[PDB]
Amino acid sequence: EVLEVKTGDSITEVECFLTPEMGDPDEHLRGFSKSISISDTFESDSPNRDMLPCYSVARIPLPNLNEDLTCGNILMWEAVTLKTEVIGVTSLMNVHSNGQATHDNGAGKPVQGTSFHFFSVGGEALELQGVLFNYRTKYPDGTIFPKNATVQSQVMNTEHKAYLDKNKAYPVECWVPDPTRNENTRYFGTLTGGENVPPVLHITNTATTVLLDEFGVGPLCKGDNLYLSAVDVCGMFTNRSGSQQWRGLSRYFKVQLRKRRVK
Amino acid sequence: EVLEVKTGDSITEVECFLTPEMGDPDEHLRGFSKSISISDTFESDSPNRDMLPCYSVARIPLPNLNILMWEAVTLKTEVIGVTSLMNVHSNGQATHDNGAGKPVQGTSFHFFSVGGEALELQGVLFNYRTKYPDGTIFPKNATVQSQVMNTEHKAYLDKNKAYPVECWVPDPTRNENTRYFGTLTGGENVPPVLHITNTATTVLLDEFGVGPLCKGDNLYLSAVDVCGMFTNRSGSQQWRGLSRYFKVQLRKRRVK
Amino acid sequence: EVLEVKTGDSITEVECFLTPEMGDPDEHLRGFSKSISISDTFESDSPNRDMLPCYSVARIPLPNLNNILMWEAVTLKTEVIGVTSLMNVHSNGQATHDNGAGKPVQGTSFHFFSVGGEALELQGVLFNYRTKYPDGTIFPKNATVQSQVMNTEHKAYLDKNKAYPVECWVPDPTRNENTRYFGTLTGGENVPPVLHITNTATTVLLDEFGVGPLCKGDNLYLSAVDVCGMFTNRSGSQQWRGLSRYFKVQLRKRRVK
Amino acid sequence: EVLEVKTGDSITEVECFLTPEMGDPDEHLRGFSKSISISDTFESDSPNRDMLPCYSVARIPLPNLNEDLTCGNILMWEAVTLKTEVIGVTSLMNVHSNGQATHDNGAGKPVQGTSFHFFSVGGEALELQGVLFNYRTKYPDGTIFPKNATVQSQVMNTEHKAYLDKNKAYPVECWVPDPTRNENTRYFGTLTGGENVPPVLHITNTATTVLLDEFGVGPLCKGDNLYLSAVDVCGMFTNRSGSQQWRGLSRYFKVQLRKRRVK
Amino acid sequence: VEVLEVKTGDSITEVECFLTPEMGDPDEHLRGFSKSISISDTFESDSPNRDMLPCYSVARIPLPNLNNILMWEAVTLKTEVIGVTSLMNVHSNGQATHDNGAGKPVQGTSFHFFSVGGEALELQGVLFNYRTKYPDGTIFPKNATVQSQVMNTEHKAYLDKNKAYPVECWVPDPTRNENTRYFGTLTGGENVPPVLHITNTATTVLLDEFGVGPLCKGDNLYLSAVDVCGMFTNRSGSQQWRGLSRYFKVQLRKRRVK
Numbered sequence A, D: 001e002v003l004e005v006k007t008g009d010s011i012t013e014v015e016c017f018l019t020p021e022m023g024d025p026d027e028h029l030r031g032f033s034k035s036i037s038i039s040d041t042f043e044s045d046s047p048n049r050d051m052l053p054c055y056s057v058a059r060i061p062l063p064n065l066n067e068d069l070t071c072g073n074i075l076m077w078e079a080v081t082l083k084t085e086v087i088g089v090t091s092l093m094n095v096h097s098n099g100q101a102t103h104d105n106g107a108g109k110p111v112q113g114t115s116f117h118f119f120s121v122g123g124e125a126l127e128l129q130g131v132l133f134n135y136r137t138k139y140p141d142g143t144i145f146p147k148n149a150t151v152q153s154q155v156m157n158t159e160h161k162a163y164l165d166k167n168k169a170y171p172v173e174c175w176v177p178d179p180t181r182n183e184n185t186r187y188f189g190t191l192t193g194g195e196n197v198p199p200v201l202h203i204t205n206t207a208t209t210v211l212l213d214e215f216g217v218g219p220l221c222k223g224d225n226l227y228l229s230a231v232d233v234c235g236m237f238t239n240r241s242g243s244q245q246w247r248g249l250s251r252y253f254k255v256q257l258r259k260r261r262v263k
Numbered sequence B: 001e002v003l004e005v006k007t008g009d010s011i012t013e014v015e016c017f018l019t020p021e022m023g024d025p026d027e028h029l030r031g032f033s034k035s036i037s038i039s040d041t042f043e044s045d046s047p048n049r050d051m052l053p054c055y056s057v058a059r060i061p062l063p064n065l066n067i068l069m070w071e072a073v074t075l076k077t078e079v080i081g082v083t084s085l086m087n088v089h090s091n092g093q094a095t096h097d098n099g100a101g102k103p104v105q106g107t108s109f110h111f112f113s114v115g116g117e118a119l120e121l122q123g124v125l126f127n128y129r130t131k132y133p134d135g136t137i138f139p140k141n142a143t144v145q146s147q148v149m150n151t152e153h154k155a156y157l158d159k160n161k162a163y164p165v166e167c168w169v170p171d172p173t174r175n176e177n178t179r180y181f182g183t184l185t186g187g188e189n190v191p192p193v194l195h196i197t198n199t200a201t202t203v204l205l206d207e208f209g210v211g212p213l214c215k216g217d218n219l220y221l222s223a224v225d226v227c228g229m230f231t232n233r234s235g236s237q238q239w240r241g242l243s244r245y246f247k248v249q250l251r252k253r254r255v256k
Numbered sequence C: 001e002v003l004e005v006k007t008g009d010s011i012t013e014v015e016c017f018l019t020p021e022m023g024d025p026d027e028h029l030r031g032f033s034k035s036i037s038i039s040d041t042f043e044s045d046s047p048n049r050d051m052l053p054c055y056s057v058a059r060i061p062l063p064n065l066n067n068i069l070m071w072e073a074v075t076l077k078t079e080v081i082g083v084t085s086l087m088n089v090h091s092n093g094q095a096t097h098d099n100g101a102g103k104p105v106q107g108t109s110f111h112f113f114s115v116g117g118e119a120l121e122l123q124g125v126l127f128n129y130r131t132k133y134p135d136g137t138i139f140p141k142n143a144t145v146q147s148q149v150m151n152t153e154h155k156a157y158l159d160k161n162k163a164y165p166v167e168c169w170v171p172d173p174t175r176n177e178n179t180r181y182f183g184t185l186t187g188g189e190n191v192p193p194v195l196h197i198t199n200t201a202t203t204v205l206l207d208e209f210g211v212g213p214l215c216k217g218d219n220l221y222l223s224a225v226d227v228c229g230m231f232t233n234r235s236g237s238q239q240w241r242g243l244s245r246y247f248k249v250q251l252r253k254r255r256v257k
Numbered sequence E: 001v002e003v004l005e006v007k008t009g010d011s012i013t014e015v016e017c018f019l020t021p022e023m024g025d026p027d028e029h030l031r032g033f034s035k036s037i038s039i040s041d042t043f044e045s046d047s048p049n050r051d052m053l054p055c056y057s058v059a060r061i062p063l064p065n066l067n068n069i070l071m072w073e074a075v076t077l078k079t080e081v082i083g084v085t086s087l088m089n090v091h092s093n094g095q096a097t098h099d100n101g102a103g104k105p106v107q108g109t110s111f112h113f114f115s116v117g118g119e120a121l122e123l124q125g126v127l128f129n130y131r132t133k134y135p136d137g138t139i140f141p142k143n144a145t146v147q148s149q150v151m152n153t154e155h156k157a158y159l160d161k162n163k164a165y166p167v168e169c170w171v172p173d174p175t176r177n178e179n180t181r182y183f184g185t186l187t188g189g190e191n192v193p194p195v196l197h198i199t200n201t202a203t204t205v206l207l208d209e210f211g212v213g214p215l216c217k218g219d220n221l222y223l224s225a226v227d228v229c230g231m232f233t234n235r236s237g238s239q240q241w242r243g244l245s246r247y248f249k250v251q252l253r254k255r256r257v258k
């Protein structure tokens, strides 16, 4: 299956940013959701599309390989390393833009509370498994959500399989990486839950993640395409009124790739 | 007596989900407990079965071998559905006027084990006068000494939806043939911190390079993943649990 | 003079649990203290015996040996027993809010363990030198205001159970050459317990010279405190709650002169 | 093309401190911002200059290299190591002046809440990317801010490129290090957000950061100049009235450099 | 100094001692505590009482006389805070956390600091408020200006006296202290929990990147410490700093120098 690395135009780099998809409720609110409203009963949960943060995905074309007929073997791009970080972490220091004061005469409350920080690099679409907080939640038109939901969907219903293959579509609260698949992807995520959780965001151009498995093989890019996926829900912004909106930020990716021969 | 590892047909892998057992108080509430109620005295503590999270267990039959035994070498594991806890809109309690719903938070217990036989348990009671309900398996002949250590309370995790998390722990005096890991984080306001990655492996070999050996060609997987409590609009609180993924690599080992 | 390790009959293991000594104020409350009450002044601080957690200790005899041979402690596995009991939030606790669950055990904790070839050596330090400690405890005597920072008179051995109150004694860092000790104080009213359990973790007890505790008279000394925090009952009154500690120690025969 | 390190006057050291630039609202309040005011609407956000912390920067001249004509080769100073620390951490124990009591008869509230701790060492100016919390924020005269802002500026507008080439000018909340550039700079930053986050400030003269990349090459100093950049927003001070001011501290740098031949 | 070979064989010595804390000691019963903390109405009126100000602790330890000369080189340190369990006294004139509750424990701003040097710790002055009037009996930054709130290079001192150098206006000078190793953490916040570790198993190596430790000038070793653990809240709500002693064990060896 996997043979030697090519040396000597044998390496390439992908550098890009993925924008967040927090719901964008009007022309002025890119990076924010709609304010969160709470259903009157548990069974009537019915979130609007613009209140639901979704997974981000980019498919990046790589230099075309195998332009001439080959015999029993091909080249594939192998993703070897990743640098990543959240872009615009200092924007969360704006505590003066019509937020809710911490106390009388105080500054605005900063973005804080529940966060999900997630990134993946793969040679194909991230494979997802559905899990629902509430199987009677009515998910809205324009989203791709677990179908034929049962009470078992609240813990594990193996019917709920999907590919992260569309932007602004797969709600964060419905889907996770499928650990039974993703052989050709490396994924990393942290959920920090709680209304008062402080954002802790590190930036450096000195940190590298190695994407090689225990056999020294990185993701292999099918069709000369690289799949990047992210979520960076940083917390909620609290308006003067008390209403709360999810706030997301963009994620930087730099991936180094090498040509690998495979049978 | 443990001899050489077979090479070549000599490896297998187990992959599965263990669903949580939080109490499931009605046909809509898989993954949740009944809302929690408080006794007015220690002597009147009588929790209903559907208010008690229990240990999860699966006995997984392996390919029949016979001697040779399956040896568990490595584990990948993670909690499945961590993002579901971002639902802050399903009739929860607003943090403040016009605010979002309070997220799942508070006391958690995250636990998993891999063994070649049932997890061995030791009983310890918060309150020795607690009356545990019909259909649970609980420390019997409890005394005030049961609040710190009573060696009578020995059991095997040999039944699903049976062994309440609050009365049992892994027995550190046994479990020679099991590897176990758990963390209790206590407090009504503790934030869930849940990591997911397909790049993390736990090695199950002891200091002598021997992994759990599967008696009768059976692998035992155990879990608890109490994530915290959900607060309803009324203020009532239910435990919330999530499923745990296990991938175990095994190899054939000659013994005796 | 420490000489060679014996190989081959050369090894033994000790396995046991130490119960917590929290004060046990009645026949139903083993593992709890009395409810905490507060003095009106520093000079009137007068805590009752059943309100003071104490250090736990076991002296464990080893196989008789008699360059001479001595038992050398090399490795320790340890963990808190019954961490999941702290999930009982339905037993006369104070609701965290209207219709809510009981407040779990939380706040000030002390988790400590030591392994030695002789009794743990203690130094007394008092929060308040005017505290009147109760009959049946062993406490710093002839206390002065200097006892609030460092009075070298306050030297003791942890040589008795249910006796040495946690708040007036610490391991003496000027002694304890023949013991290995480890402790964490986490202070504050709302601190969450964080309790880890696993049978895969070992502590090596060898010093920088490759030498472990050497057991005088073939006795091993195990000490512990596991104050996990406070339990708040329906009335708001607070009690210390403790749990037992498991120890497993591997020992080997060492020749000495 | 990087060649061999010169040995033997082949080494030099830079030592200095960067003062913080928090806004300095009067002649007594060096190191503090103006008290924070909250806009009446999200659209009307218009912070005053003395309410905005800015990035700090110093450019340090090194011993002059290449005084004689050379042929195809030059020497450059290469930055190899950094010692850095926040100067004055114990000042935050002043809880006895002009403060708001934590409770009846209690001590003053200490400096706490949102912090940004950042430093960089480079052979040229730090390259910046603009990200705005609110694209309709009116930034004040005397600051250098992202121009021609659009709603996209709330997540990622690639027009917003700058150099940290002026002190007291680039607002912290507008700008981050550009991860798509900065090949010749090493940067490190942490945003800890939240109204009540406690400052955690470590000092030691025993800690060293190595500035070499994966090829053993540090920042190379163009024109024999070293660029140091810092932000140390420690949190907010709370007045008796409840009014809150950012508080910053100075940062110490010690950089060891060696002469490197390059072709 | 040219640093030459280490002596082997009579070539080692050790120093073991404790430094008491200096929190202000406002009466004959309150050793280890400051005076209750009060709040001036303005920066201009900030006039802290001497017994309300914690100070750096220092000990100069004479070593065995040695004298191309030999100097004692500090190689390793074991250190810990003494009496951590004393903070479990929540029954002594404390403010109840809630109705019928236990006393509020020591919590809030802490500073834990220690240093080992072959000469006095070098200090740099930094003022929260340049208009603070430091009291008679303290050694404080002189000729303060508004620049003293960020960096005024005039404010240079030696930690050369006890009960003198207030913690809040002095830090180790990072521009000097070549011949010292220093370590400190400030943990701010009104409600921060103390987290105090003890063990006799932890050693700090004091050698720099060239394998050289502090070299003791005139055969004197300088130990310095601060252990402000947080504040104690009494029944009225008034708050006092509380400190604890620090243990030091330093191993030293003879080093030839020119």
Ligand SMILES: CC(=O)N[C@H]1[C@H]([C@H](O)[C@H](O)CO)O[C@@](OC[C@H]2O[C@@H](O[C@H]3[C@H](O)[C@@H](O)[C@H](O)O[C@@H]3CO)[C@H](O)[C@@H](O)[C@H]2O)(C(=O)O)C[C@@H]1O
Residues within 6 Å of the ligand: A041, A042, B025, B029, B032, B033, B034, B035, B091, B232, B233, B234, B235, B236, B238
């Ligand atoms: C997640 C969830 O289900 N939340 C609900 C919660 C839980 O189901 C229980 O607490 C689990 O033990 O129940 C809440 O209501 C408690 C009361 O229910 C009343 O019945 C209602 C029911 O709640 C409605 O949904 C239904 O449409 O109508 C019923 C009225 O006939 C009972 O009569 C009353 O005794 C309580 O049990 C709760 O607040 O605890 C509602 C949560 O949404």
Ligand SMILES: [Cl-]
Residues within 6 Å of the ligand: E068, E069, E070, E256
């Ligand atoms: Cl000499």
